A paper describes a structure:
The PRV capsid, similar to other herpesviruses, has a triangulation (T) number of 16 and is composed of major capsid proteins (MCPs), small capsid proteins (SCPs), and triplexes. The triplexes, each composed of one VP19C protein (Tri1, encoded by UL38) and two VP23 proteins (Tri2, encoded by UL18), anchor to the capsid floor via Tri1 N-anchor.
From the same dataset, we selected a total of 14,252 and 8899 particles for PRV C-capsid and A-capsid, respectively, and, by imposing icosahedral symmetry, obtained three-dimensional (3D) reconstructions at resolutions of 4.43 and 4.53 Å, respectively. Local reconstructions were then carried out to finally obtain the cryo-EM structures of the C-capsid 5-, 3-, and 2-fold sub-regions at 3.31, 3.46, and 3.43 Å, respectively, and the A-capsid 5-, 3-, and 2-fold sub-regions at 3.64, 3.50, and 3.41 Å, respectively. Five CATCs form a star-shaped tegumental layer that is situated on both the penton and portal vertices, forming extensive interactions with the penton and portal proteins to stabilize the conformation of the vertex complexes. Like other herpesviruses, each CATC of PRV bridges the space between the penton/portal and hexon by binding at two triplexes, Ta and Tc. Based on our localized reconstruction of the C-capsid 5-fold sub-particle, an atomic model of PRV CATC was built; however, only the N-terminus of the pUL25 subunits (upper pUL25 aa 1-73; lower pUL25 aa10-83) could be built out as α-helices; the remaining C-terminal globular domain, in contrast, was disordered and failed to be modeled. Indeed, we observed that the peri-portal Triplex Ta rotates counterclockwise by ~120° when compared to peri-penton Ta.
Numbering used by the authors:
A (entry chain p), J (entry chain m): 3 to 50
B (entry chain g): 1036 to 1054, 1056 to 1323
C (entry chain g): 691 to 739
D (entry chain w): 494 to 542
E (entry chain h): 24 to 82, 94 to 340, 348 to 368
F (entry chain o): 1 to 296
G (entry chain g): 51 to 326, 337 to 444
H (entry chain s): 1 to 148, 168 to 296
């Protein structure tokens, strides 16, 4: 779910928790949560 | 058939632990999936070995069941206990922690079955027991009849258009025989009830959307009974594969029986003599 | 029930089931003695004089 | 309590695995019963021996 | 290795710069629920708000070093009082010790015993202190010297117990035994006489896995004088009625008055004998409570060496549950 | 010894709810490295006594991370060196640092996951500090008892404190508190009365001694050495011939009482299963929030 | 001493009942699926009622997860000898070490074997649960297309109720006839339907056309069949000796890592969208009807001398019912012959009273009768 | 820690019999690292009550290896709760997976590996599940209370058991307990409208024999029936007592059975893995 | 334990417990004539020994 | 969402509506449904 | 377990009194004799070679 290859760097840092209004989803975990390292996919094997 | 199953085997892995010694416990995950539209396998049940359970008699004892309000004069039901539990196995002996039937000693044949008794007027026609019948009289089941047929009485009995039922004390909603062998009336005991599946509509939640569903479901329905020295109730989780066409028809077969031993003799002859009667054997076990 | 077995077994052994015709008080005098089930007989409104 | 000998025991329910007669019925020519540990004949009132 | 606990708190009772590491610390319950449970727990006759007042007279602070608590009891050797008083940096300290004494003496009077107010943690090893705010750190399992203190003079530590309170048992009871691995128990001793009562603390070691009869005999005088002066201030009625004698002759009476089951109402239940078990002012269990103990761990050796002290030997922290000692 | 549980795929939305219970405990059956969710399931409307008795014949295990495929558990009974683990407190009131937790069924109003897609329910037992649990059980039982005799139905003092805040002890009719607890209060009150009766039958003159000088003296003599005031237990009357319908052998009754009391005392928990050793966190964990624990 | 009978799963004829492919990343996949599409033909009616359009429909079947496992415990006394910690400098400890390592080898040899008979058992466990009985299967296939109105469903259930109770035990109640058995077997073989074709099976006869199915039995029934009704076809068959493979690589990887799915034939879909060793094993065949199937009874090659029951001894279940104390109406009591079971002269006839017991034969044959007083367990209880 | 038990010289007639005792438990008295066999030894069978009282005063130890010189052991519980070891069962009832086990002195005697050369005998205690050990202790203590496959008591220690029992029972009587004692008829009447309510009450209940024979009046209001409530206190006290009544007469369950692969139920005379508590 | 007790029913006809109260209990009449450790052995063979 | 390339063809035909109970989810339609024609995707258009 | 040995001995009791004599009770069923001989041969097990 997270990104693999960033495209553009950000020139200016800012406090993010102030500007929650500009964003549509917002998730801020402390440090190294457990969800990032789940590689669990699902797909069709064969069609007929 | 040539290719009836896809079979995927994963990758093995070796988990260690300590137990005196060292327990290496292998494990390999694998999965399969049917890949043929329609059926791809069948079996016939050709031969027959000895019946794994005895086909004898064992009068079921209710005194292992609770939820029935007792009788006021405690001496009365004390006498009931003191006389009916006498000379009756599977009596709830109050040995520590369980109050369960004591472990019997020695077995004639396979595990002994259990018998029930359902009230019925004396003027029930006898010919209803020659062919395969339903202990209720309303032969509802599910396969032949839409929902609402199991307890209605403004609609005829499908298997006997003549009457409405054949046993008033055993068919009506909230009738007597219902209040003892139903699914949601909390009057079950540790002993198995061979008629538990005949007075139960709780499968109303499991509505049937195809005859093939019931067909495939039969022949592999997990076992409801135990495997000890009796027919005890078993947790539904464990189970075991067993075949039973009863739950598809909700019908029972009459065994070879007669109201006098003097009728069941090698020169069989007449099948109705006097008040004493005989019932020929019409079952899947003609031999 | 302070009654021998026979009265519980049959229905006509009870000392509490009055006969349909009585000429005296002998059955009634025997009736009230069984309070294990509160019995009562109403004669025109009075118990009996 | 009722004496077992007088009130008849049973026809089939005697051979049941529970009753207190099989324990004392094991010879066609002799009987076995329990009795007060006294000499016979003894005094009038039954002693609690 | 061993497992640790860190609890930031106030520097009122355990003062981790004043003592060096290696001494057991206790966790103090929130006092609000103690003051509340008193309202329903103090026995009849006694006061029912005096613990409220005793607490209000001492005004979160959560830990208390055993070195501090042992001083605020009856049993103590005045050398340790002098040490706690003149060696603690803190202001107003002796006054606080006095108030704490009054608190515990109120606790036993109100039948909410301090053993239901002090869970035990391990021995502290480290601390960082602001101005009157500390964060102590104590072991919780494993052996003490698996830790690592930031002293740099003695990385590891031991366990120190005030030798004034350490009561040995086996050599006391003369079991004739031979010192091997012995358990370690922290025990409390209550005594109940209204407005004249106190609390005694001890630290007991022995091979006895089950104290029980051992303390019941050790504290015989306490149990004796506690069972008789404990019911005081409770109005007992006059001489007990003869109807209080529970009739036993009537169980296997073949001929006796009997009642049909389910009819305890107005219908003829009068001929039954009356029996009034009436128990008002007799010694209840909380009245005969005299001691309470809790297992601490296992010990090799105890040596005495200096203020007198008692260095443990290979203490393995294994804390257990509390226990009553009333019978 | 970490077990995984096959998970029959349910749906979106519900799987989020299953993900939210990443800290509770579940009672397995046997230590096998595989198990089906259908196995660890209990009808969330159930008898409290039977559930508390069954909690012994099982193994506790906490739900670690979950995935749409499976969920991982870790048993608490067996273990190596008692490693740390996380636990979601789910009692009615918080628990402090440095104490012992106990596992009791949802005695008060119940909460239960209803996985409507798979058509099964789950019960997650409460997590209580030791003394507070041993007192809450008595609270609910005593309220039911006071109600039983039809006396004053309320006294305004069925409240329990924990770290300041006052708790209300929700009204005893919410889910089935008038039905799923009847068994417990009956089975406890009855045994208490029976013990009292047996004692008084063995010592008939106990409650006719001095109100303050006889009873205390008897108790202190009994606790001390072998005087015992002779056979303080007077010889009970001789029984009937064991077929008379009114036979009463007191000693067999005492035997049955000892057995039943021991059994009931063992099927009540009150033997700690874990101990909070939180570290690097707020020293007091509120309900619903995880808390570092080491198994005992 | 004793050897250890090794067995490979691909040699057995049961392999031709399934396709086996290693999928080394199964431990990662969530619930996988497979998509079918099928297009039912249609015939042109005529007349008043309007015609219909040819129908289409899709479907998917999800997987299910199973697993194998086996314990392999070794002890401390020998663990100290393997790793050399407990090893001593002697001429005697060396021999004990040799013994210990030989024991470990002879143990791992057995535990590795179990993962072949594991599949041998799992395939039977699986197939045994999806195959409906033949009895309930023939007439349903005879009534296809008419199960819309109720009356046809009734005509179908009235025939199921007979097929269950009459065609359920052959070769035990028919031991005089021969072609009835073979014809029942033909119905069994022809009532199913062929599944998807794949080029990886190639399960061929020694000479010619490929095989179609298997026939697993218990040794007794196989013995009764191979000497009266069925003639052995041949004694060998060329089979595949390798598995298949489904791996994730270089196109499935990007999609599985960023999107969350990965189709098996992803390379084919890609290269189309944008432009872009048979072994010989001694198996025993048999010809039935017009087909050619493997005939086995695995009770010996596998499952032998162990602690598991054979999954081919199933369990039938019947519920009997008998009336206890019914009394026939007046107009139905009659002696078939005037010379009746005449009782002893001088005493009255108890054959007129209402009967109060039933007599039935037990499992072996000794009669055991049920009387009213046995119902005391039911008709004497407050529940009444 | 590994207790080391040294052995004297032994005849081959009994060394080979001692080899077979690889999963049974013995009772030391002090936990030194070394200890001679003569020390850990109990006299021949007698006074199962006294012996059961002695197991409380000593901590157990199970043995693992038996060499021609040396015989190891393991102190069962002093600091550990997960030292998974193996010990063989020697009680009649087969113990199943899941439940705890408690040590109980042997009955009838006859279990004595009588060593003639060393001139001593051992009596290894049997291992029973909790549910049945409780009942056995109940039976034996009741029989001891009677005297004011079965051995008779000794009248010198049976009084101690009686004392413990009568104390634990006496301290149940509280001014709150009488309030509960007041609703015996209100309990019996409740045990009539329903089935479970009647089920919980036993048959020789020793209370139904009372509620139908004696009437008791309304209880006297205790001192300050407004501030505090007594039923709660009495019930809490009873819970606290009953939670620890079983062990005070018998012995705490010492270990619970866990098995990872083998068949669930293990028969008598066969070793089975375990974890201690 | 199945041979001499009379609480566990007859394991061949489980209706009753025994089919002959004079030949099944220990020390019965028919037992004291053909038991191996009561020693009334004569010269002739005994098929029911 | 139909398949684009079937792995293998089905050998035998059968009335499939009657055997519908074997399958988990499915759907039939008259002929040439409009839904399976428009297929629109959702794309993230730059990570940062 | 008991349930297995029960049916085992119950089938043994039937196998004794039906198949203790062949080629004297059944000379008509010529093939049944060869059946029984094949059973007899295959029922045993090979020893070490």
């Amino acid at each position: 779910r997270p990104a693999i290859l960033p495209s553009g760097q950000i020139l200016s840092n800012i406090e993010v928790h102030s500007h929650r209004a500009l964003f549509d989803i917002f998730k801020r975990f402390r440090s190294d949560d457990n969800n990032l390292y789940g590689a669990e996919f699902d797909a069709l094997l064969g069609t007929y | 058939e040539k290719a009836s199953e896809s079979y995927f085997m994963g990758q093995m892995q070796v988990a260690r632990t300590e137990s005196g010694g060292l327990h290496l416990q292998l494990t390999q995950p694998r999965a399969n999936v049917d890949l043929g539209v329609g059926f791809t396998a069948a079996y016939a049940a050709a031969a027959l070995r000895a019946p794994v359970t005895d086909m004898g008699n064992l009068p079921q004892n209710l005194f292992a069941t609770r939820g029935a309000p007792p009788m006021l004069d405690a001496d009365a039901d004390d006498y009931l206990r003191r006389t009916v539990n006498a000379g009756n196995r599977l009596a709830p002996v109050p040995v520590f922690g369980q109050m369960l039937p004591q472990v019997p000693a020695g077995l004639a044949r396979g595990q002994q079955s259990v018998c029930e008794f359902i009230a019925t007027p004396v003027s029930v026609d006898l010919a209803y027991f020659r062919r395969a019948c339903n202990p209720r009289g309303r032969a509802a089941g599910e396969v032949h009849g839409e929902e609402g047929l199991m307890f209605d009485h403004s609609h005829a009995d499908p298997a006997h258009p003549h009457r409405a039922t054949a046993n008033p004390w055993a068919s009506q909603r909230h009738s007597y025989a219902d209040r003892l062998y139903n699914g949601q009336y909390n009057m079950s005991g540790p002993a198995y009830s061979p008629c538990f599946k005949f007075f139960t509509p709780a499968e109303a939640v499991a509505k049937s959307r195809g005859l093939a569903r019931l067909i495939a479901d039969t022949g592999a329905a997990a076992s409801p009974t135990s495997n000890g020295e009796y027919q005890f109730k078993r947790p539904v989780g464990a189970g075991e594969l067993v075949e039973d066409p009863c739950a598809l028809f909700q019908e029972a077969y009459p065994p070879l029986c007669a109201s006098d031993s003097a009728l069941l003799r090698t020169p069989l002859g007449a099948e109705e003599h006097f008040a004493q009667y005989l019932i020929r054997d019409e079952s899947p076990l003609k031999g | 029930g302070n009654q021998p077995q026979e009265e519980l077994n049959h229905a006509l052994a009870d000392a509490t089931l009055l006969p349909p015709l009585i000429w005296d008080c002998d059955p009634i005098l025997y009736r009230d003695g069984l309070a294990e089930r509160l019995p009562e007989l109403r004669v025109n409104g009075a118990h009996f004089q | 309590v009722r004496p077992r000998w007088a009130a008849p025991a049973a026809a089939d329910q005697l051979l049941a695995p529970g009753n207190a007669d099989l324990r004392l019925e094991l010879h066609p020519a002799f009987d076995f019963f329990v009795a007060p540990e006294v000499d016979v004949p003894g005094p009038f009132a039954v002693p609690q021996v | 290795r061993a497992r640790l606990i860190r609890q930031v708190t106030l520097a009122d009772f355990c003062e981790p710069q004043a003592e060096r590491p290696g001494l057991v610390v206790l966790a103090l319950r929130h006092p609000a629920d103690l003051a509340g449970a008193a309202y329903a727990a103090t026995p009849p006759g006694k006061n029912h708000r005096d613990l409220e007042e005793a607490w209000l007279a001492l005004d979160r602070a959560s830990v208390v070093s055993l070195n501090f608590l042992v001083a605020a009891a009856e049993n103590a050797d005045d050398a340790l009082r002098a040490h706690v008083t003149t060696n603690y940096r803190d202001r107003r300290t002796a006054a606080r010790l006095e108030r704490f004494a009054t608190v515990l003496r109120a606790m036993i009077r109100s039948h909410v015993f301090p053993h239901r107010a002090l869970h035990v943690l391990g021995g502290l090893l480290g601390h960082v202190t602001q101005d009157r705010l500390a964060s102590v750190t104590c072991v919780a399992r494993g052996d003490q010297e698996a830790a690592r203190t930031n002293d740099m003079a003695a990385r590891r530590s031991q366990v120190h117990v005030p030798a004034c309170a350490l009561m040995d048992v086996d050599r006391e009871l003369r079991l004739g035994g031979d010192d091997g691995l012995r358990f370690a128990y922290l025990v409390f001793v209550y005594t109940q006489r209204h407005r004249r009562e106190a609390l005694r603390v001890h630290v007991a070691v022995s091979r006895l896995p089950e104290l029980g009869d051992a303390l019941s005999f050790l504290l015989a005088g306490t149990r004796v004088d506690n069972a008789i002066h404990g019911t005081d201030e409770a109005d007992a009625p006059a001489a007990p009625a003869a109807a209080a004698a529970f009739p036993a002759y009537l169980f296997n009476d073949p001929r006796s008055a009997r009642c049909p089951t389910g009819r305890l109402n107005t219908p003829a239940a009068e001929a039954l004998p009356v029996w009034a078990p009436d128990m008002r002012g007799r010694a209840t269990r909380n009245s005969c409570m005299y001691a309470a103990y809790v297992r601490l761990g296992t010990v090799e050796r105890v040596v005495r060496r200096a203020l007198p002290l008692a260095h443990m030997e290979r203490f393995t922290w294994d804390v257990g549950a509390w226990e009553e000692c009333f019978f | 010894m970490e077990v995984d549980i096959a998970l029959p795929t349910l749906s979106p939305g519900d799987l989020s709810a299953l993900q939210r219970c990443e800290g509770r405990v579940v009672f397995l059956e046997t230590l096998r490295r595989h198990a089906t969710l259908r196995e660890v399931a209990l009808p969330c409307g159930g008898d409290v006594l039977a559930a508390m008795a069954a909690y012994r014949r099982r193994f506790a295990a906490v739900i670690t991370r979950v995935t749409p495929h499976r969920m991982l558990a870790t048993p608490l009974g067996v273990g190596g060196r008692g490693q740390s683990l996380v636990l979601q407190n789910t009692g009615p009131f918080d628990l402090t640092n440095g104490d012992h937790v106990c596992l009791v069924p949802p005695l008060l109003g119940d909460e239960c996951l209803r996985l409507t897609s798979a058509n099964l329910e789950l019960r997650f037992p409460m997590t209580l500090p030791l003394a507070q649990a041993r007192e809450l059980t008595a609270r609910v039982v005593a309220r039911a008892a006071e109600t039983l005799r039809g006396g004053a139905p309320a006294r305004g003092a069925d409240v329990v404190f924990s770290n300041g805040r006052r708790y209300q002890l929700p009204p005893p009719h919410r889910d089935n508190a008038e039905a799923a607890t009847r068994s417990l209060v009956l089975n406890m009150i009855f045994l208490l009365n029976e013990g009292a009766v047996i004692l008084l039958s063995l010592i008939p003159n106990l409650l006719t001694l001095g109100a303050q000088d006889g009873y205390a003296n008897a108790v202190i003599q009994l606790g001390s050495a072998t005087r015992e005031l002779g056979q303080l237990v007077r010889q009970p009357p001789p029984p009937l011939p064991q077929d008379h319908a009114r036979r009463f052998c007191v000693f067999e009754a005492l035997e049955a009482w000892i057995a039943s009391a021991s059994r009931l005392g063992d099927t009540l928990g009150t033997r700690p299963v874990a101990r909070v050793c939180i570290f690097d966190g707020p020293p007091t964990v509120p309900p619903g929030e995880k808390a570092a624990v080491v198994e005992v | 001493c004793s050897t250890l009978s090794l067995v490979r799963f691909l040699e057995l004829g049961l392999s031709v009942a399934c396709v086996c492919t290693k999928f080394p990343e199964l431990s990662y996949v969530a619930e996988g699926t497979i998509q079918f599409e099928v297009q039912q033909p249609m015939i042109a009616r005529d007349g008043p009622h309007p015609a219909d359009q040819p129908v289409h429909n899709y479907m998917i079947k999800r997987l299910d997860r199973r697993s194998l496992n086996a314990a392999f415990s070794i002890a401390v006394e020998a663990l100290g000898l393997i790793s050399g910690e407990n090893l001593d400098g002697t001429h005697i400890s060396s021999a004990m070490r040799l013994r210990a390592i030989q024991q470990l080898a002879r143990n791992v040899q057995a535990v590795l074997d179990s993962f072949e008979r594991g599949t041998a058992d799992q395939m039977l466990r699986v197939l045994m649960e999806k195959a409906p009985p033949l009895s309930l299967l023939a007439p349903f296939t005879l009534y296809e297309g008419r199960l819309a109105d109720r009356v046809a469903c009734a005509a179908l259930v009235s025939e199921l109720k007979r097929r269950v109770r009459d065609d359920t035990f052959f070769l035990t109640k028919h031991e005089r006839n021969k072609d009835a058995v073979l014809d029942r077997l033909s119905d069994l073989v022809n009532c199913t339907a062929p599944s998807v074709a794949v080029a990886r099976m190639t399960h061929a006869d020694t000479q010619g056309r490929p095989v179609d199915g298997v026939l697993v039995t218990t040794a007794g029934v196989r013995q009764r069949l191979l000497h009266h009704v069925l003639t052995l076809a041949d004694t060998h068959a060329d089979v595949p000796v390798t598995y298949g493979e489904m791996v994730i690589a270089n196109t499935n990887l990007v999609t599985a890592l960023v999107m969350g799915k990965a189709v098996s034939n992803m390379d084919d879909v890609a290269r189309y969208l944008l432009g872009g060793g048979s072994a010989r094993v001694r198996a025993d065949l048999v010809v039935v009807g017009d087909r050619l199937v493997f005939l086995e009874a695995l009770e010996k090659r596998v499952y032998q001398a162990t602690q598991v029951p054979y999954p081919l001894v199933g369990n039938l279940d019947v519920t009997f019912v008998m009336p206890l104390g019914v009394f026939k109406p007046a107009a139905d009591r009659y002696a078939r012959h005037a010379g009746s079971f005449a009782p002893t002269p001088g005493l009255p006839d108890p054959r007129t009273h209402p009967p109060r017991a039933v007599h039935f034969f037990n499992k072996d044959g000794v009669p055991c009768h049920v009387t009213f007083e046995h119902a005391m367990g039911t008709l004497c209880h407050p529940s009444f």
